[PDB]
Amino acid sequence: MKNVGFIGWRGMVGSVLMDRMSQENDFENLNPVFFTTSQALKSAFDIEELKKLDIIVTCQGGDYTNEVYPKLKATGWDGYWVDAASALRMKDDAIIVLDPVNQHVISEGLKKGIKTFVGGNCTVSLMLMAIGGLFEKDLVEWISVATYQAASGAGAKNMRELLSQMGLLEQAVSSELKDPASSILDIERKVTAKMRADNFPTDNFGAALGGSLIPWIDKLLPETGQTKEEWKGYAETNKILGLSDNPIPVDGLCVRIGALRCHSQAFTIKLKKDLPLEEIEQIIASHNEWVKVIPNDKEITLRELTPAKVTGTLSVPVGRLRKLAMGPEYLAAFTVGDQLLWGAAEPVRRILKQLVA
């Protein structure tokens, strides 16, 4: 059996991985070695210890990767590096994994001798898992996106801050709310007042999230005006599909909203050919076993297409499908997916399963 070392397995992403791996009994087929950065298991900074492993799975982070990775491969280490961090995604000797979408790219890479595999951007993979079928048929000319991103994508503390913010907003009018005859505008003035108060906790987002939203995620790229988050749309979608030569335009705005762990996305998809809505749906639905097409019905949409429904599950619903007024080659679509699963730990867990097979 393969000797696999794990780093950052105690973090939030790492913990989801450990849990999913237990659930699927992945540990039965490999020999796990756990590392730590603490000086209170092996040291994550001991290159010789890591050098003995066949595979390394890290959820530790980019700083860790940029530090340890170059050293280890510099020793001649011929093993596999499976990383969740973005650090290596855009390396020539690396491949971005999303096997239900790009297995063919993964296989060929393994044969080509690639030894570094990295999970991709959460919003990008959640998009591909949803509308992968369209890409598989080369039916996508371009795609405009508007995202509704969860706090988990920013971190555990960001999630807690969001929750604290929600608490304080309500507390500011807890009694008024109980009084069924109370004034709505007065309640409103008070909650907005607290949202704006000096003691309203916004250290992590740099702005209120609960009761609001933030149309900016990550650093700005002066070159295009996009934020790194929005940039990853074009860059990562194509590297995953292996189309850096004939790049499919993917762009839009990435916005943070008060959700815990599911990212939702509104798509304006330009199809290369006018096809009947029903044929589009069938194509969408048959690409993989997780995507789920939700009928353009109100009650079903309210029960299925929301963070409330998909949180903590591997289901990737896509609905509100219809043609847009701009023309029969313009498709509207809305999807919801869990950020910590297909958006983080799952792709990692699945490339590992293949490597130890």
Write out the binding residues for phosphate.
Answer: 89, 232
Binding residues: 10-13, 37-38, 60, 89, 149, 152, 229, 232, 256, 339
Which one is catalytic: 122, 254, 262, 287? 122
Task: Tell me the C-alpha distance between 357 and 352, whole Å.
Answer: 9
Task: Tell me the C-alpha distance between 333 and 321, whole Å.
Answer: 5
Least distance in angstroms from the C-beta of 270 to a second copy: 8
Least distance in angstroms from the C-beta of 324 to a second copy: 5
Task: Tell me the C-alpha distance between 308 and 300, whole Å.
Answer: 13
- In sequence order, what are the beta bridge partners of 167? none
Establish whether 104 is a catalytic residue: no
Which one is catalytic: 59, 254, 262, 263? 263
Least distance in angstroms from the C-beta of 315 to a second copy: 14
Q: Which is nearer to a second copy, 47 or 253 (CB)?
A: 253
Q: CA nearest 129: which of 19, 237, 258?
A: 237
Task: Tell me the C-alpha distance between 141 and 273, whole Å.
Answer: 9
The Cα-based distances of 278 to 239, 281, 293, 322, 340 in angstroms read: 30, 5, 11, 9, 31
Q: Which is nearer to a second copy, 34 or 142 (CB)?
A: 142
Establish whether 262 is a catalytic residue: no
Least distance in angstroms from the C-beta of 91 to a second copy: 22
Least distance in angstroms from the C-beta of 246 to a second copy: 14
Binding residues for substrate: 149, 229, 256
Q: Which is nearer to a second copy, 74 or 326 (CB)?
A: 326
Question: Cβ neighbours of residue 6 under 8 Å, at least 6 residues apart?
Answer: 14, 18, 32, 33, 34, 35, 57, 58
Strands 42-43 and 55-58: unpaired
Angle at alpha carbon of residue 286, lines to 280 and 288, rounded to 5°: 125
Task: Tell me the C-alpha distance between 157 and 201, whole Å.
Answer: 11
Tokens in use for 134?
């369209």
Q: Which is nearer to a second copy, 257 or 351 (CB)?
A: 257
Contact yes or no for 315/308 (Cβ under 8 A): no
Q: Which is nearer to a second copy, 272 or 323 (CB)?
A: 323
Active site residues: 122, 263
